[PDB]
Design a protein around this ligand. Sequence first.
Ligand SMILES: CC(C)CCC[C@@H](C)[C@H]1CC[C@H]2[C@@H]3CC=C4C[C@@H](O)CC[C@]4(C)[C@H]3CC[C@]12C
Ligand SMILES: CC(C)CCC[C@@H](C)[C@H]1CC[C@H]2[C@@H]3CC=C4C[C@@H](O)CC[C@]4(C)[C@H]3CC[C@]12C
Ligand SMILES: CC(C)CCC[C@@H](C)[C@H]1CC[C@H]2[C@@H]3CC=C4C[C@@H](O)CC[C@]4(C)[C@H]3CC[C@]12C
Ligand SMILES: Cc1cc(Cn2nnc3c(-c4ccco4)nc(N)nc32)ccc1N
Ligand SMILES: CCCCCCCC/C=C\CCCCCCCC(=O)O
Ligand SMILES: CCCCCCCC/C=C\CCCCCCCC(=O)O
Ligand SMILES: CCCCCCCC/C=C\CCCCCCCC(=O)O
Ligand SMILES: CCCCCCCC/C=C\CCCCCCCC(=O)O
Ligand code: NA
Length: 390
Amino acid sequence: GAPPIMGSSVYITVELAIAVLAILGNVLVCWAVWLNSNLQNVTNYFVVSLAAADILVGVLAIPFAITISTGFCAACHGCLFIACFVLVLAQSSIFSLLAIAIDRYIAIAIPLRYNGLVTGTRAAGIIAICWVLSFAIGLTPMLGWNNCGQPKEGKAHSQGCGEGQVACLFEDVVPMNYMVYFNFFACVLVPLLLMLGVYLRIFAAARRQLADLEDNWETLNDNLKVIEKADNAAQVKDALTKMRAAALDAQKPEMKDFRHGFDILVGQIDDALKLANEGKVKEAQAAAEQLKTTRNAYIQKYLERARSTLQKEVHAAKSAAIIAGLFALCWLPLHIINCFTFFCPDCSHAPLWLMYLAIVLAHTNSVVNPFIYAYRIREFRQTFRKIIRS
Ligand SMILES: CC(C)CCC[C@@H](C)[C@H]1CC[C@H]2[C@@H]3CC=C4C[C@@H](O)CC[C@]4(C)[C@H]3CC[C@]12C
Ligand SMILES: CC(C)CCC[C@@H](C)[C@H]1CC[C@H]2[C@@H]3CC=C4C[C@@H](O)CC[C@]4(C)[C@H]3CC[C@]12C
Ligand SMILES: CC(C)CCC[C@@H](C)[C@H]1CC[C@H]2[C@@H]3CC=C4C[C@@H](O)CC[C@]4(C)[C@H]3CC[C@]12C
Ligand SMILES: Cc1cc(Cn2nnc3c(-c4ccco4)nc(N)nc32)ccc1N
Ligand SMILES: CCCCCCCC/C=C\CCCCCCCC(=O)O
Ligand SMILES: CCCCCCCC/C=C\CCCCCCCC(=O)O
Ligand SMILES: CCCCCCCC/C=C\CCCCCCCC(=O)O
Ligand SMILES: CCCCCCCC/C=C\CCCCCCCC(=O)O
Ligand code: NA
């Protein structure tokens, strides 16, 4: 058995490196949102809350994890707090990630009433509530669901702990049924599955809306061909009645030129419709040919800006789903190991070095979020450069 301080020195040094990187990167995230007003929206208010929890990981959780790895003597309820405070920050992260996904779903499913529904003041109240719930969930062991009533008295005396103290070890004080049933299944796994379902609805909604923009555009062009090769006044009326419905369906600085374009489009369809109802088929086809001018000058531009906006919303949702996916990737090994500890008492406990590896991997998550915003969000990246240069 090698001396514990050799392996502990590597673990501590890595933990301190992660703490420094988590603090620096996420203080930069908060600084960027504080200065740049283009970054000041509801989505980024949860981003800041998410970054604040990552800051507290390096300031408190990582020093707590270094402390509780030594198994020092402590009063059980005080030992419970340094054991469970990281569960509060992990819970806070989950609420912020679920809020970001829900916020993006509202922006893409009901964009007309997004600003009136999702406001900045309601977001700050939600964030306050989620932090209160995160403390209550994460510090539930301090409410009585703990093993302080049955202290390992042999381990406490072997380390010279005083009366009323225990050897502060996570799996000694935190019950494993809490970690698996309450923390993992109820408070971690179910919300992550809810995020997955929200993102699936987001990408399904975007794909359908792009589909609708391509259908109405093709409906417009196909009915134009029908009018050209028609032979009576009834075929022209049938095609124009479809375009007028598709134009009004599609109508539902640049907002003034696009409203003018659809006023021309629907108006010209009406001109050709009246000429068709009068039996003037040749005059109706010529009036419908003026629609091509309106299409190339106004309607084709609306379809490309609407296509561009939806593509930006997909990219933004993909970036947010990457954040929530890496969170699961970084925390699931720790939760899976707890499942083996709890559900298989005949299996040997996962080796200590694998425990150290899982703990470090979970802490690393507090570093990766500032890199995703830099590589995937131009507004964050450009603000990051201006902060670092200045
Ligand atoms: C705002 C920031 C600075 C507050 C930080 C407070 C932290 C460092 C304090 C608050 C509660 C404290 C714990 C309270 C109770 C005990 C039991 C004792 O037998 C060992 C110390 C221990 C485990 C303390 C460790 C330090 C502790 C966790
Ligand atoms: C989250 C994604 C990346 C998958 C992570 C897989 C990890 C967490 C899984 C895969 C294989 C698993 C191990 C398989 C076998 C054993 C031996 C058993 O006596 C203790 C648990 C232990 C050591 C498991 C720990 C968890 C484990 C290492
Ligand atoms: C959808 C996914 C990500 C949810 C998380 C998967 C978890 C809950 C699953 C995946 C692998 C599973 C483990 C596979 C093997 C064993 C060994 C068995 O003797 C006890 C149950 C236990 C320990 C399982 C517990 C539940 C488990 C850890
Ligand atoms: C080896 C080592 C251990 C701990 C104790 N510690 N913390 N967090 C945990 C979890 C957990 C958190 C979230 C989901 O699971 N699980 C278990 N078993 N121990 C934990 C702390 C530091 C080290 N190095
Ligand atoms: C731009 C960032 C520049 C560098 C930032 C700080 C780098 C921190 C690197 C590791 C610090 C490790 C401190 C050594 C303590 C070892 C613990 C021990 O002796 O047991
Ligand atoms: C602008 C958003 C501010 C976000 C921070 C919200 C401030 C409240 C923070 C946590 C209060 C903790 C109250 C304790 C609740 C649970 C008590 C327990 O279970 O032990
Ligand atoms: C795990 C502990 C569960 C605790 C359940 C009770 C906590 C939930 C409390 C209410 C959440 C919503 C608060 C609504 C604030 C209303 C104020 C307002 O609308 O202005
Ligand atoms: C590329 C994926 C990450 C690679 C680095 C991590 C490599 C080790 C990962 C875990 C494998 C499982 C190790 C088995 C634990 C010992 C089995 C036992 O005796 O109980
Ligand atoms: Na986090």
